[PDB]
Design a binder for this molecule. Sequence first.
Ligand SMILES: Oc1ccc(-c2c[nH]nc2-c2ccc(O)cc2)cc1
Length: 299
Amino acid sequence: EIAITHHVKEGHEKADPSQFELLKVLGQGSFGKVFLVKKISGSDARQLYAMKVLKKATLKVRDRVRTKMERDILVEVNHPFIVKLHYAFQTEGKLYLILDFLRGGDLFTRLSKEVMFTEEDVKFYLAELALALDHLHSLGIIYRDLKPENILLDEEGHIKLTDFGLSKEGTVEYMAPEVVNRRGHTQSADWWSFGVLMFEMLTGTLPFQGKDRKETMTMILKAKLGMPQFLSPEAQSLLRMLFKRNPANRLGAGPDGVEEIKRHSFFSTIDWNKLYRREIHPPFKPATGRPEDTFYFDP
Ligand SMILES: Oc1ccc(-c2c[nH]nc2-c2ccc(O)cc2)cc1
């Protein structure tokens, strides 16, 4: 309901600490700290959100100005398969970002537990991801580190790409040959990482992995991809089209971008309009902390 209203306006709203109730810390990492918070007043009163807290000392100083790019990169990001920045505010030493709260964990947790995903699951996750990447692309934003940990699941099983790897147009194993050649991260490199993620979900392994950085680097540049034979011809075709060393030949890098991906035989069963509208039932429904799916019953 609040989503339709945010679709007509750009950016986050103003807020302050008094409008949030803190429940718990969801996590801590090199990024900062994430809290589970509840909105107290206004139209979204009682709504749960994830509050990410950043220390200002970590923030980049450019032309004598301490920048807040973690807040500003999200100004125009507004898609169903990407986290939305709802509010942002500062204290003397911190930057606070209020984002969506996702209950179903991340794709890293699911992949580690299940080892590998079926082509059905991969087709679903990748289709939703292609729409998210295409949304960022139309904004001149690319994704550095498109790994399973950066994709969250909601209680229904729909994806939400996190804002962690967002950057204006990192793990070496996910880097495209042109990025290894220090040519800069373009939308075409995103499609290479899309293929690396595709390979990892389907195999539980990384396509180019060496004994040290040099070998991984040289393998990304020169190694022929080892094609797994348990994969369908459509899946194999998508992988060889995404793993083209020359970015100009890579699927999704053509004149019609994402349309090349959507048109691919691997996604022939995907109704892109129903997928966008979340009318496609996710093939996996994750476990949540919610009592309905944790309590045992003897009716
Ligand atoms: O370690 C964690 C990572 C992510 C979550 C989480 C759960 N729902 N939403 C988020 C989220 C946090 C920060 C963001 O920048 C975007 C999204 C929790 C713990």
